Design a binder for these strands. Structure first.
Length: 111
DNA sequence: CGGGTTTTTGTTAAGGGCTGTATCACTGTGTAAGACAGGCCAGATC
DNA sequence: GATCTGGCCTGTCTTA
DNA sequence: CACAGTGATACAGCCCTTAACAAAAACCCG
């Protein structure tokens, strides 16, 4: 309606937003653990995956009737850290530190 | 009223990229009480 | 003193 | 034959390029 009345593209179409979404969602930024994760793959492009984690759905074994969707924890934390980079940099600048510091950060979480 | 001359307007083919629209399988709003027929015990009775 | 009547109940159906 | 949504996918539609030609709308002159 805005583009039809005004005649100027103040907002972009839906596909532009759909394309821009791929920057904030997890499984987009590269990373690497010091000591390789145990029993965990190294794919850094793992988005939304099935929550059943490959659970068998055959009629023979234990009947399962639940669906699930979830991210991968490590990619989730990577996306979370990418989301709040500006706040971390501002906190470093406020406490009279250097922006080029790379000391071991400590991040506590609440499940 | 035409040639000579000039400035606009398409026209083909193939490929790229942005925009708009149809298509898929579905939902949430239609949600408490009353009329009535049948069975059954307590009791007045002739 | 069994014998129906009356009312009490009670499950079912009809709209929501 | 209730009907307005609801997010992702595919495809039509509508812009873009080069390349010579080819037609259309006007003014000097005859």
């Amino acid at each position: 309606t805005v583009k039809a009345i005004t005649g100027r593209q103040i907002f972009q179409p839906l596909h532009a937003l759909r394309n821009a979404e791929k920057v904030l969602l997890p499984g987009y930024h590269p990373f690497e653990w010091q000591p390789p994760l145990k029993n965990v793959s190294s794919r850094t492009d793992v988005g939304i995956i099935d929550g059943l984690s490959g659970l068998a759905s055959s009629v023979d074994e234990y009947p399962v009737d639940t669906i699930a969707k979830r991210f991968r924890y490590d990619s989730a934390l990577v996306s979370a850290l990418m989301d709040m980079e500006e706040d971390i940099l501002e906190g470093m600048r406020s406490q009279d530190l250097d922006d080029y510091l790379n000391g071991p950060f400590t991040v506590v979480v609440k499940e």
